[PDB]
């Protein structure tokens, strides 16, 4: 069955509040922050902070609509949904009283939606784009990507092959010749495993 | 709301083989390994085993109970119970192809049953046992062990205080005066935060 579920804790770039749909629907868009660990093509150590979109919708929205400030600690569980724009659907929020222990993790299930395409970055390390079709845990379409090693393995895989994901979600960006950058939330890759079938 | 969450990748140290309640019900019974690093007392990098039992009942049971070898690798996700011996319940399992990325995950959210109360082992480390009571995400009693800094920093909490606990499922050792050595799994937290309320 395919599966997808993220949990992360974040602060609150700015206050929460409350919008409604047309038809009264209550809406809590909170906008996330953190940092994570990486080793950079040099061996060096480094963070690189996460911005995220969090939406609530009904009844956590109106729960929690009056209650949340700009600079709290939230912890999240949720999916990963479009609304383009990759955010993530709480399932339920719990602020925190927030006065390293990363938590930004996705896990995913599905099966890939085309081959894979290695590539090597100019400095020559390995780098993979997966396509991944999950159906509810219709059909949803989610990209990973994932680097070094994992990407030198995942190359083996192709279109229809089942995989399991453990990532973590990142910003990537996207800049054009004249200089301008673009940002896009996807998911890194930091173990796969494949499912038996 | 209470939670509790649990999320294992390890490998079968048996075969397991289905078994049956007197009503019928189906059980599988898995015995999982792995490992999990750590820093010792000394500042050293160390690697120990953990073994834990997880249970699927049912529905589950029937689906995998002639599937699954020893030596292949497991994805679980459940909940942590009792049956005293704490033990995973499994929510369903993916066994895995399987031919580091450790996965042994615990959430709990909760309130503290009792006072924290502070220890110092031996060698100074601070290390602090918690109780926690979780309605279920009636009332399961769990155990939680922190060390170092989260240690200190869990000396603050009363008995009622709200707990959200970011761990691993391990084994500790139990010595009898006479070298007998026995075995409990608990959760080690690595990472605490406060709910609000």
Redesign the interface.
């Given at each position: 069955?395919g599966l997808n579920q993220v949990?992360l804790?974040g602060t609150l770039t700015a206050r929460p509040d409350m919008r409604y749909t047309p038809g009264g629907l209550a809406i809590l868009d909170l906008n996330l922050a953190g940092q994570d660990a990486f080793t950079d093509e040099s061996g060096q150590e480094r963070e690189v902070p996460w911005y995220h979109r969090v939406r609530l919708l009904g009844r956590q929205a109106e729960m929690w609509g009056d209650?949340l400030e700009k600079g709290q600690?939230i912890?999240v569980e949720g999916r990963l949904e479009y609304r383009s724009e990759v955010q993530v659907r709480a399932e339920?929020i719990?602020?925190?009283?927030?006065?390293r222990?990363a938590?930004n993790?996705v896990?995913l299930?599905g099966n890939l939606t085309r081959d894979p395409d290695l590539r090597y970055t100019p400095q020559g390390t390995a780098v993979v784009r997966l396509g991944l079709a999950v159906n509810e845990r219709r059909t949803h379409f989610l990209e990973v990507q994932a680097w070094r090693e994992l990407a030198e393995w995942a190359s083996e895989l192709r279109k229809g092959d089942g995989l399991?994901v453990?990532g973590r979600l990142v910003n990537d960006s996207w800049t054009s010749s004249s200089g301008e950058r673009r940002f896009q939330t996807r998911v890194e890759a930091?173990?796969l495993?494949?499912?038996?079938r």
């Open positions: 069955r949990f804790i209650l600690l912890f339920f719990d602020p925190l009283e927030g006065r222990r938590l993790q896990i299930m399991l453990i930091l173990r495993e494949r499912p038996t």
